[PDB]
Design a protein around this nucleic acid. Structure first.
Length: 91
DNA sequence: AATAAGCGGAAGTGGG
DNA sequence: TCCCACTTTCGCTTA
């Protein structure tokens, strides 16, 4: 099954949910969610995973927080903004 | 108050 | 056995 960071990177590359997520500085790997349209993206994540419950942005963001220690995605001190690692961007 | 973003102890589910 | 990679529940903090 796809990993969450890869699901998000793939969306950013495809442009398929441009109103829910976008690059801030793609060279740095920084990206941001839409305040008003992030839930539709979270719903898509949960359906792609086949999870039992409806996925929420809060549960998805909790998964994102767990990447902080391994480094794939880090929270940026800007609203709804995160940053992929160079390793994730290079793969 | 109402709303929203951000955080995490603990415990459950999947597929190794 | 016991870690993977989240998922789910619920309370808390700050703005």
């Amino acid at each position: 099954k796809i990993r969450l960071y890869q699901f998000l990177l793939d969306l950013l590359r495809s442009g398929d949910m441009k109103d829910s997520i976008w690059w801030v500085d793609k060279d740095k790997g920084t990206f941001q969610f839409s305040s008003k349209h992030k839930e539709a993206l979270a719903h898509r994540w949960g359906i792609q995973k086949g999870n039992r419950k409806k996925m929420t942005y809060q549960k998805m963001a909790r998964a994102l927080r767990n990447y902080g220690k391994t480094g794939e995605v880090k929270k940026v001190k800007k609203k709804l903004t995160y940053q992929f690692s160079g390793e994730v961007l290079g793969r």
